[PDB]
Amino acid sequence: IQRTPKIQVYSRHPAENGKSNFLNCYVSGFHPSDIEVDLLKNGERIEKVEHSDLSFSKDWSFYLLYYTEFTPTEKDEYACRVNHVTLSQPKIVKWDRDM
Amino acid sequence: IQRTPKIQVYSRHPAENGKSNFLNCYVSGFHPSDIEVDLLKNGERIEKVEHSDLSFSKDWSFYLLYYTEFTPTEKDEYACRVNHVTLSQPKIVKWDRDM
Amino acid sequence: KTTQPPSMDVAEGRAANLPCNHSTISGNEYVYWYRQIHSQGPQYIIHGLKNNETNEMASLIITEDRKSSTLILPHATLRDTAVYYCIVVRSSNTGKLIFGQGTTLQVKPDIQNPDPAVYQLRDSKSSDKSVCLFTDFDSQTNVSQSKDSDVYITDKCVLDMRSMDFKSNSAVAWSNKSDFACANAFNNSI
Amino acid sequence: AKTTQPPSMDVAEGRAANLPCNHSTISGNEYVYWYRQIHSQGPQYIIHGLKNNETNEMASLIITEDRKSSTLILPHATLRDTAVYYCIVVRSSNTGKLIFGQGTTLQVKPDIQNPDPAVYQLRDSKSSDKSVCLFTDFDSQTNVSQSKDSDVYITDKCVLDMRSMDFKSNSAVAWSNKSDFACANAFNN
Amino acid sequence: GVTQFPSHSVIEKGQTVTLRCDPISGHDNLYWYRRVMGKEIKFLLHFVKESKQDESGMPNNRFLAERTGGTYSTLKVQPAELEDSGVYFCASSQDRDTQYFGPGTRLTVLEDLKNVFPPEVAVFEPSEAEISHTQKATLVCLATGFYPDHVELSWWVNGKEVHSGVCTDPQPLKEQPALNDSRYALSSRLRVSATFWQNPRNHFRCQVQFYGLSENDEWTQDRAKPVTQIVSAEAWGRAD
Amino acid sequence: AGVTQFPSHSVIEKGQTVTLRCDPISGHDNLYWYRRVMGKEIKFLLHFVKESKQDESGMPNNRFLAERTGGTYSTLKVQPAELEDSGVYFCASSQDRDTQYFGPGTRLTVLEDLKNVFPPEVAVFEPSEAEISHTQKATLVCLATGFYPDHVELSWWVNGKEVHSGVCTDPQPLKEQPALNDSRYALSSRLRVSATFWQNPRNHFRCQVQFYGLSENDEWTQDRAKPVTQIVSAEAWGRAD
Amino acid sequence: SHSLKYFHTSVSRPGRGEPRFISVGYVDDTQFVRFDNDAASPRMVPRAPWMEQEGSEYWDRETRSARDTAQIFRVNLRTLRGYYNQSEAGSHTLQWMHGCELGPDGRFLRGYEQCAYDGKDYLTLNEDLRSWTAVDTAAQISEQKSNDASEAEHQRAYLEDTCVEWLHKYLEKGKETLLHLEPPKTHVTHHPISDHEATLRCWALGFYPAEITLTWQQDGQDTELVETRPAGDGTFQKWAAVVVPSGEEQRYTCHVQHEGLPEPVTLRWKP
Amino acid sequence: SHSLKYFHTSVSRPGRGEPRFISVGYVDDTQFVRFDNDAASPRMVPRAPWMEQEGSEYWDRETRSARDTAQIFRVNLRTLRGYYNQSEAGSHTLQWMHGCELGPDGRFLRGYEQCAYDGKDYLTLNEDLRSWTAVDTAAQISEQKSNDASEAEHQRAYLEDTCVEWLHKYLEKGKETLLHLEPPKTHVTHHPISDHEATLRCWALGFYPAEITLTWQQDQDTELVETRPAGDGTFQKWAAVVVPSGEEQRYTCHVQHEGLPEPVTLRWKP
Amino acid sequence: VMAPRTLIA
Amino acid sequence: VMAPRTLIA
Question: Which residues belong to any copy of the Ig-like domain (chain C)?
Fold first, then answer.
């Protein structure tokens, strides 16, 4: 059947350039399960990145939460690099503290 | 398996050198069935030589009567030529009107 | 060569005595009994020559004159309802069966306390309801066919809820006709 | 534990057999199963249920409101129904394995309308070793004692049915290779 | 027990059918009997091992029977004709006195397969009147419009096939009695305790196995291909 | 219908390799192995869901290996066979996993030493003349003695056909020398017929006892005959006297 | 004391086709019918004047019996070949006999039935007519079917009922010829056999039935006998011989006992 | 209204070995347990503080369930491959869910059970909890065993009795956390998406449960983002509208949550 | 009249 | 608690 993912990238608490936080990459509505998700800090993949246990919604489409503790700063860029069997090339989604 | 025949050669009625008669060759006690029997006149096989229907005695050994109408004469010699699967060469037995 | 009744009745529990005639039998001709429960394979019961024979199933009683024979099913059951073939077989090297018409044996259930009634069953996916049931009548009653041909009536059918030890006689009737109705359904049942 | 039954129960054939079973420690997703074993051949499923009563071709299962007790009812016992009756709890799983308790051994006592007890003595074909005694045609409420004379041998009672003739005899065989032995005296009374 | 194959057979006139029979292992003697329409059961052929002993009952050149292996036996009708339509019973014997018969192959040769129809099957729920009057609930099941009369009816309660409290018609009704090439109807009753019908929402199923065309036989007709198949009707118990 | 198992009996020496087979009711996805060692009750071994093992929890040790690769019939190999294995091995199939249909069971006896295996001696005893006049019936008794282990099936044959009506045989065989273990067994049966049927001199009565012992494979050397699997039998002809 | 014996022979011929099968029937010493496949009439036919007026039903039945017996034996030849593990190339014989006997009283005396493979006993119906005797390991497999079948029953039924019923009917049908006793015409021949020795042959000719007792006695006895031979006209002939001192012939007398003689006849050599 | 749903996923891996099998359990919107075979512990484990005291019997049982479910699904993957006539080389997905629901009262409202092959319905337990719905020609063959089996019975028994019994026990075990309603913290953002254009985003943060209705009304085509997890039990959502340069004040945001006394109404502050 | 039934070996 | 028993397709 196959469904392309949907990628929301955000922080657990409202962004403050000083206070400890969590960067979240929530991937949802995808099929099959096999997905690749990375949290970027300035175009580099983060190694220690935890993720929710695999679950699915009514329509059988899967969702995972990827997240790591982070401290946001004025210059530091954070993104989420998602690849799937539906994505012709890896999709990156840049964190803006306004969305 | 396999038993050699016994050949008695005689006339149905007592031999009289002028009167019509029947020459009998009675082969018995043989096994298996397949036998060859001829009535001879001075050598030479007689045509028109009828024979009993195949039967056997208690010990399973077969017997046949071979016979032809004949008129015995002072000079004419009659014999019986029997060949069998047991006889290495054909056995001939001469009609002797006293035995 | 062998002549029997076309059909015989026996109340279940009581013995069934199936007669057979064969005046024209010889001393090398044995009397065989087979049966057929609906149209499945024929089944050997018993056979004999001159003296009486009993076996697991039945007993065969040949007359002194050997012209007549009787098969005894000691206690008849609803299973024993079947066609009973009486066949003479001359001692041969095949012993082929020649099947006569045979006695059709009805083992009557005996419904000591009946209560005849006609009920009407509703269809699953309905508004047609298209069926009547005449049930719990004694086996000695007979169910006629309509003589309408717009209606259909079945032969009577014995039914056994053995655990509960109960037996009901049943006959179904249905009609795809504008003017349908039960009670009138089994008009012409004694 | 998990299911406790009587070790053995008797029922005169024709009359119903009520096999009780105890299981206080049962849960809501634990079903009550009944199997049996007629001599040592394959176990045979009878019936099962959860909370409500169930009946089937063979038997009926009566589970109590409190669900701690159950009763299996064989409506009219037959000589076939003589067997070991296993009452087994099976928790809803993907295997549903049977755990076999000791079980109730049910003796269906044959209804012998006209008893005619006797001891007979049977001779061997090629003989002088007459050897064997037969105690036959006795009522099923009779019990056959074991030898105590280990040179003498006695069998268990054995029901026999000549169904065409509609007849049933109880039988028990006894023999002794002690030669000068008597049948009369055997099956001591 | 003697084994036969197939249990049922429906073929077009001119086509070739072959019946099989496996005798009780060891039995030297194998027999073919048959009951053509009208007549009684009649003897065809008797084998003593691989060798034919009595052919006296074999109709004509179109019927050919072989038991070369001296075990199982074949019987080939070629070409098949209308008059052949009947039940073909195989039997085996050790002593030639007791003949053990198989269940029989049921053969229907049909002028044109375009009059073969499968059954429509409805379950009718017990009468509320009956349940109060007796303490019992007769379900009736009705299979209609099928041809030829090659159906086996069975009652299933939930997932197990019921036998107690059942009875089905032996002979099916012909619907349009006068007419030949007439489609048949068949009824059955399953009686249960009123409580068993009304109390649980027990599932009742009336299964009718119909024998028609195999996937091989061509069709072309605008309706569905008759085919051998199980048509069924269902009914759930009702406390209300 | 019915689950089929093979072989019906097995008697082997400790160390030897036996393999049991089971054919489930055609269609049944679920196949089970149970067993009853001497003394204990029936216990669960293994559960297959098609070719795949689902529950092994009851499989004793490494010596027992079970396979159903062709997700139909199942094998069970004991290698090497040991004394404690001696019991009945019951196969079952289900489909619904609620009702389990059991086969007749493979009966396995692993024996220290095969030189104590004996087949049965079998005698038929003729009806009592007293009985025939009293009851108008004739009980024949048959007695199979001196056999070990207790692997016998008894059957009554009247004129080449096997009789069932008017028969009954002991469930348990008796132990000759009751006290002693490694004791040889005895088994009795009765066939009752109408006095008339017995009094017919034409009627042949045969008491057939199938005994299960050594296969041709197993070596012997002992001066007596090899106690293989075999049919011992006794005969009696009816007597008008 | 009379008999109704038949003698069936089947012989496989791997070269040619179906085995050769022959039946012959005898009331006492008189043949009356025979069947032979590989013959113009594939049918049972009369072999005695007094059988020539039996109806079509008789001959049509007795043909069906012989033909059917031949077909079964066709199978038996191939069966026994398998049993004994013999090649198709070799030809083998299968013989079946059966006979009943009447007493003086006219009632069934005894009946017997045997078949032999290659001229040696195979399977034998015992005196009691209810059990078979297997000669051989193979015959037991055959016997196992015959026992389990109760062929014994079917063959007892033939030997005790049918065989005697029909023996009776034949004795009446051919009473002129069968129930007649023809006594022997007796004479004595002499042949030198050297000078010191001499032979004395006692002849008995033209006697039915074939049962006869020729004995050579001297006053105060080593005789040569020859298989009684058929004359070829219903009647039989036999001779006994004795070697005697040359010129002392008159001490030696021949005693001929026949059923058809008032009193046993005594002979001496005609000078 | 409370729920005890589980979500089982099995995925065949022809390259690797045994299919990957995962279970997750949810009381309402709170996960509390999970099983994952290709993990350090091939065992069911807690995923919520209040499950961490349940003791060995519970975890040993619930492990046996998951492991057994995985073994059956191992077979089902291969079975359905045969049914649909697919090659061993291709990898396929098999998903099974089951859930019971409590009503306004504390009593059983409804139960449901479905499995899907390759992200599309395969076989469905109907409302009445006694009959199955086969999506497909193949699902009928499966259904034929499920019907003939009366799986319906076994699954009804779970959904009606055991599922609700254990939903109740969990609601009490985690009452401190579960039975609490956290309402949303609501605010309204603005960013000049040009000079003439302007965007207006209504935020709702830190609310449990996840059921929420954010709506933009004027005295009208609004952008939504699927409710997302905060990553601490709570959830967040925003709705947006592109609105004329000035005249933001004509647009008001309406936030409906179970944990609010009365639906809250917002406008852009500055 | 000959034996109407014969042995199958 | 999860469903103790599951479908065999």
Answer: 1-88
- Which token pair is G28? 């006492």
Contact G49, G31 (CB under 8 A): no
Do the chains contact at H191 and A98, CB–CB below 8 Å?
A: yes
Q: Cβ(C80)–Cβ(E81) under 8 Å?
A: no
* Rounded distance between C-alpha atoms, residue E84 and residue E80, angstroms: 7
Q: Which amino acid is residue C136, in one-letter code?
A: D
Closest-CA residue in chain H for D94?
A: H68
Same domain, G123 and G241: no
Q: Please state, in angstroms and rounded to a whole number, the distance separating the CA atoms of residues C106 and D47.
A: 34
Helix, strand, coil % over all residues of chain H, rounded to 5: 25, 35, 35
Q: Does residue E123 sit in the same domain as residue E80?
A: no
**Locate tokens 């006889």: which residue?**
B87
Q: Are residues G40 and G116 in the same domain?
A: yes
Does D1 contact C at CB distance below 8 Å?
A: no
Q: How far is CA C95 from the centre of its chain?
A: 28
- Whether C54 sits inside 8 A of F163 (CB atoms) is no
Last residue of a domain, one of D59, D80, D109: D109
Q: Test H24 with A54 for CB contact under 8 angstroms.
A: yes
Cα distance between residue G111 and residue E184, in whole Å:
61
Whether chain J lies against chain D with 3 or more Cβ pairs closer than 8 A is yes
Tell me how far apart the alpha carbons of residues D55 and D72 are, in angstroms, rounded to a whole number.
Answer: 10
Question: Which domains does chain A carry?
Answer: 1-99 (2.60.40.10)
Cα(G100)–Cα(G111) distance, integer angstroms: 4
DSSP lists the bridge partners of residue F55 as F47
Helices (H), chain G: 56-84, 137-149, 151-157, 163-173, 175-178
Non-local (6+) Cβ contacts of H137 within 8 A are none
> What residue type is assigned to position F237 of the chain?
W
Name which of I2, I4, I7 is nearest G115 (Cβ-Cβ). I7
Tell which residue, E77, E102, E95, has the closest CA to residue E21: E102
Chains C and I are touching, with contact defined as 3 or more CB–CB pairs separated by less than 8 Å: yes
H204 touches H237 (CB < 8 A): yes
3-state SS string over A1-41?
Answer: CCECCEEEEEECCCCCCCCCEEEEEEEEEEECCCEEEEEEE
Strand pairing partners for F204? F237
In CATH, what number is assigned to the domain containing residue E215?
A: 2.60.40.10
